[model samples]
Target chain A: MIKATYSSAKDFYSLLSGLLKVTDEIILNFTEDSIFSRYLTDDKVLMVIFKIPKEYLEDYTIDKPLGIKININDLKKILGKAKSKSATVTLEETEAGLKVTVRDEKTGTRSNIYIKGEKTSIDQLTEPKVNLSVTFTTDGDVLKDIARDLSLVGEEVEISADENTVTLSTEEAGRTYKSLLKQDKPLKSLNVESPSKAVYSIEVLKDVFKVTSISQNVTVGFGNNIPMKIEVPTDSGGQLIFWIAPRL
Target chain B: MRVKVIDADAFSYIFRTLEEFIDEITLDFTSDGLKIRGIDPSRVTFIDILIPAGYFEEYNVEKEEKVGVKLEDFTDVLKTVTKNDSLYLETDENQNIKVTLDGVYERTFTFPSIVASEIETPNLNLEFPFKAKALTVTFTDIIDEIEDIGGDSITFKAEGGKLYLSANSDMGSSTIELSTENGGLLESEGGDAESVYGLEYVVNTSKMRKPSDTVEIAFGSQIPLKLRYNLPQGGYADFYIAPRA
Candidate 1:
């Protein structure tokens, strides 16, 4: 059983569902301390992490600690109603089935949904945490723009960050979009541990903004032939972390 | 027989629905209207379609005529139709139906009409304990979700003031429960009646849902599901899918 209440309307839902948008099913680990989740894309190329401490939640409780496999859209629909006037959501095991409830404190209203959870062979997944050799900070809003452009031009994008310049390049048949960001260019700021070049799928990267839109700047970390990690801070104390594997 | 329509959209609509189950179908031109009845290869379902003469802009029947044509070729020719274009259909003495499209530009396609299989329209006398009408998009959306989860069959249950649908398999389950009071329904009746249908027909037929139409459904306990939706321009298209078990 799990129950959580936030003083304000729901905010974690959008980012959580957004993470699932790229990869529709994921495992959520509910502990006595926090609600944590991580998702890897279908191609195993992208990884997403969502963390919210128990303190951040107006109220949080876990009768049992367990890993739950969830279908993204189903959760999205239940959360849709909780966009809320201080919504308190609860999931409890009932004799009938899994009963989910959402209570709007301000309106004194309540909604309930029920679903029979499926049994699958899926187990909790673990992703890699590397000591990055290179890292940089850039405006998420600008990278979002570039991501959108990259989608229209090619299947993959190449990012090369040097000591003084950061460049992005992608090309489609008869169409090419390359941006070389100098000190005065749109990247805003950059700090590289070492100059590195890596390629990733533009199609999958387009989903990055689901977390980036709410944050200010994104802290990016990567190394030669290593996975890329993007950290976007949320309005709350929570943060959304993303990992994109390199394209060979 | 000859038929003229200013809207090729209706022709496009018919082809889309018919192609889902049958590759070829026979359209009988009658004094009242145009009729088509065909069964799928495995005979899992029977489709009955009718388009009244008044549904067309100009419909003429010299003598009742029957022409069988491959739906695929028909829909292919329909792809070139411009918006609100005029279409004139007439069959020749040999092996072709002449289709003329006139709008911004004029085009003509004469294609072969074949002799499809003999299908005996079953004597369907079913008393559906449950009858309901709702936005066709609603049921289609339900089927779409089922398809998303790779479900094999879907069950429908009706209770007091609410209709429920359950599509499940080993992977998971999905349920949609809507109140009869919602504008999504025009009318509903009966209670404690439930039915199940293979996702093949329900899913494929629902895939043809158009933004312009609404669906009226009649279902009984373990009986074939009935669906009716309006054609793009006018008239109606009805479908029936048999239960898997």
Candidate 2:
């Protein structure tokens, strides 16, 4: 039997949203120490890493080490019903089936849901390599704004990093738009021995920001020929990591 | 390099609306005339336009060169051009369409054309029962009020030295009245008349011209609204929007 509870519905929603984009099925490996999963999308183009320390949940209890696969889409749909106010969600294993309950603090509205046992398929996907090693965090709103401005120019924005700055630009006809992120508050660090440039589409990047925007800080990491990584802390124990490939 | 002439203003206006449906516009330039045709981006809207051979200022072109320019980039340049500007297309063997403006100011831009579809506009003779001359600013003000009311349709009434604009919905309703005694443009020979039409279509068509030009709105119940605005020079733009039931 597995039982877990969370204080805030928003944090749960954020993590679930990020996971849904990566894969439809998530093999939630629940252990005494942590709850973690690394899953890739059906196309194997994107990877999602989710981890939650057991202590964050109010009453975390696990009968045994279990690898339960749940449909990410179903989880997302359930999370969408969560109220904006502070809410607690309880997931437990019952004799009849798996039961889920959500309770709103201000409104005192409680909803109970039941899911029958269904076998979940797990497809092994090769883990993406991480080589680059610079880290930084930026406001999600600022990142979204930049993405919107760059979208006006073209679909894919070319990003380049120098010793002290990161540059995003696109060229069309005789007009070219270039926006630079120099040593600033949001840009935490920049260390590049040689200039590295990669192209990424805006649509995918927009999804990454949706999760990270809720948090105060987002850790960004990239290396030569490595997938870009963004990590946002949900609470004291849970952390959501989203990664995507570079568009050539 | 060969010279091809086109109505820059007309092309820009049509392209703006067409881009919503089509990814690329193809223009076929022949010695006889210009032909443009393309499928909408979503395949929901298809446009086959042809500007007769006589529309061109200079139809003589012995050279044959196919230049392709990205539609998105070309539209950017068109945004900077003023009304009634003559569009000049010059191309070489391996280069894209080299565009220039022949007007008060000379400007040049070059980009590849994805598809140069020829556009043909049909000629129509429209007669109106009543015509009122009003400043662009006054008409724009009415549109602003209509937008705030928020509805699928709006009612336009003119008579008895006054013009009335009103909209209603489940949420609420609002009405704006302009008295002709205060210099409002509502001159009629008979009694007051009111007509209801789609709000979205009228609002979009209104944006096609300047707010200071004289706007002539011609409409009848269940018929399309015809908006005609004269440019600063001598040209004019006629916009027709079908009414919503």
Query: Compared with the true structure, what per-residue lDDT tens digits does model 1 show for residues A39-100?
Result: 66667887778866678765576676666665665666666666454666565544433455
Q: Write down the lDDT of every candidate, Cα atoms only.
A: 0.70, 0.61
Predicted model with the maximum TM-score: 1
Instruction: List, for all models, the DockQ compared with the true complex.
Output: 0.02, 0.06
What TM-score does structure 2 among the candidates reach? 0.53
Residue pairs with backbone overlap in model 1: none
Residues A1-248, model 2: lDDT tens digits: 88888777667767766564544766766677766777776766567878777778779898776666666666666667787648777777665445677878788888777755342333332456656655556666546545544444556666677776776666565444455565563465555656666766566666676657666666766755567778778654468877778776
Name the weakest run of 10 consecutive residues (lDDT summed) in model 2 chain B: B40-49
True C-alpha contacts between chains kept, each model in order: 0.00, 0.06
Instruction: Flag regions of model 2 displaced more than 4 Å.
Output: A20-24, A73-81, A94-97, A107-109, A118-131, A145-157, A169-178, A183-195, A199-216, A234-238, B1-137, B141-205, B208-245
> How do the residues B141-204 of candidate 1 rate in per-residue lDDT, one tens digit apiece?
7667657655778777777746766776443344556555545466787766777887778777
* Model 2: DockQ score: 0.06
